[PDB]
Amino acid sequence: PITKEEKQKVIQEFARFPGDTGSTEVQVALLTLRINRLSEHLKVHKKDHHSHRGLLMMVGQRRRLLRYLQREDPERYRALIEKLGIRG
């Protein structure tokens, strides 16, 4: 949605391809952004109840991200963990 700042270091760092940004890994990263801008939602809005429009999958997309990636690979559970916001 932004533009030039949509690649300053979003996928280019996560997506290692012109189409590896839609992967599940690059998304888990976008799961963090939608998180920070999720609390500042009603802190500016002023006419659009029914918030949280499916804006929950983002939280569940980290509280158990290992149940998917780490599950289909124990090694993959030790790379984006330091570049997303999993444990420490």
Side-chain angles (χ1 to χ4, degrees):
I2 295 150
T3 166
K4 205 127 191 298
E5 261 127 298
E6 269 240 286
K7 280 214 269 144
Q8 72 218 22
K9 215 123 134 286
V10 171
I11 94 280
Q12 61 96 286
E13 217 308 286
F14 283 135
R16 41 260 158 106
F17 265 130
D20 270 36
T21 178
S23 176
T24 289
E25 282 182 336
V26 183
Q27 300 261 84
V28 169
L30 90 92
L31 94 84
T32 211
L33 274 162
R34 273 181 168 262
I35 249 86
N36 285 280
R37 254 165 140 166
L38 166 66
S39 179
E40 251 120 49
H41 232 55
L42 299 98
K43 254 284 134 215
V44 165
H45 269 159
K46 42 168 182 150
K47 39 141 252 220
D48 202 89
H49 283 305
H50 248 281
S51 72
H52 322 129
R53 250 183 96 315
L55 242 60
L56 289 169
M57 173 171 225
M58 296 131 41
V59 177
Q61 252 239 316
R62 203 158 49 83
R63 237 284 236 74
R64 293 176 244 137
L65 168 151
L66 50 108
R67 279 250 182 157
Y68 237 66
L69 182 74
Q70 177 275 309
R71 276 288 246 191
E72 290 201 301
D73 256 13
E75 61 190 340
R76 271 293 201 206
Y77 182 50
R78 79 228 266 176
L80 328 107
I81 105 84
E82 72 215 4
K83 292 183 145 272
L84 305 173
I86 158 40
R87 297 239 311 174

